[PDB]
């Protein structure tokens, strides 16, 4: 059992002068992303989009344009610094969707509450020939 931490607005954002690498209309009408982390101090870190920003001591909130930017920055926060991070997807309705770490456990560490998806129980060479799924909507790897 794991309860995703809710996104807390009014969480401070890093010190940064602005860049052309930030959000666009996509964030207004489609979706954007938010990564939060806890920092032990004020540090300089490389922004996945602009140049250099100053991570604030304590909780940090950072809105990014793509999920991959959140995961890249988080990978670095966990690597260069030793910082726990989470990030979420945010729709223009205000709805928030917690994304990562999905279990509260990082996905490279096996966690027992996890259900198999897209797992085929056979060697890859035992997939059927296309002719055997022709005119059916299926793909030989969907089995």
């Amino acid at each position: 059992g794991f309860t995703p931490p809710e996104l807390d607005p009014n969480t401070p954002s890093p010190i940064f002068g602005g860049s052309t690498g930030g959000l666009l209309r996509k964030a207004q009408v489609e979706e954007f992303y938010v990564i939060t982390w806890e920092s032990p101090k004020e540090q300089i870190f490389e922004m996945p989009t602009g140049g250099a920003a100053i991570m604030r001591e304590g909780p940090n909130l950072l809105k990014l344009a793509r999920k991959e930017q959140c995961l890249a920055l988080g990978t670095r926060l966990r690597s260069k610094y030793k910082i726990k991070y989470q990030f979420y997807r945010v729709f223009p309705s205000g709805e928030v969707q917690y994304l990562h770490p999905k279990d509260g456990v990082y996905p490279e560490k096996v966690n027992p509450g996890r259900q198999g998806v897209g797992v085929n129980f056979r060697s890859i060479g035992k997939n059927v020939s296309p002719i055997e799924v022709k005119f059916t909507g299926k793909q030989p790897y969907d089995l």
Binding site: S13, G17, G18, G21, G22, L62, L64, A65
Partner: protein
């Protein structure tokens, strides 16, 4: 003291504030162009835009065209500017038909730079866009006619 700041204070919206972008001269001038008159009927803004542009297009067509050196028809080469007004008005029309449906509301922003709620421009509606296209056509044909009406006492006729 530094001249460049993030856009509207938010440093993670992808842009910057410069003398080019946010300046009283620039902000006033852009705010006083017809396209940026959000409360005005789009038909009138289309009239102004069409008048300016249609008037402008006459020059290059007449002076650079193929009949330019036959002053008998070279002056009358303004028909080409008229035709370009027709084509552009087609492009506007199909842009609005493609972009806006009958009962959809405006897609323009309904906020101001300072955060207060705004009423969105009707230009970004099907009816508002149709009105802006009709106005651009009328003003454009009219501006071409007005430029062609003046052939006299100009250093480059």
């Amino acid at each position: 003291y530094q001249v460049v700041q993030p856009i509207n204070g938010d440093p993670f919206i992808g842009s910057l504030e410069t003398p080019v972008t946010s300046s009283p001269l620039v902000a006033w001038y852009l705010s006083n162009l017809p396209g940026y008159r959000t409360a005005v009927n789009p038909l009138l803004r289309g009239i102004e835009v069409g008048l300016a542009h249609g008037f402008l297009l006459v020059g290059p067509f007449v002076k650079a065209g193929p009949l330019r050196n036959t002053e008998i028809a070279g002056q009358a080469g303004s028909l080409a500017a008229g035709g370009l007004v027709v084509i552009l008005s087609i492009c506007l029309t199909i842009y609005g038909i493609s972009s806006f449906n009958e009962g959809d509301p405006s897609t323009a922003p309904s906020l101001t730079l300072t955060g207060r709620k705004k009423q969105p421009d009707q230009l970004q509606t099907a009816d508002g866009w149709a009105k802006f296209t009709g106005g651009f056509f009328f003003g454009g044909i009219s501006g071409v006619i007005w430029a062609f009406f003046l052939l006299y006492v100009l250093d480059l006729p």
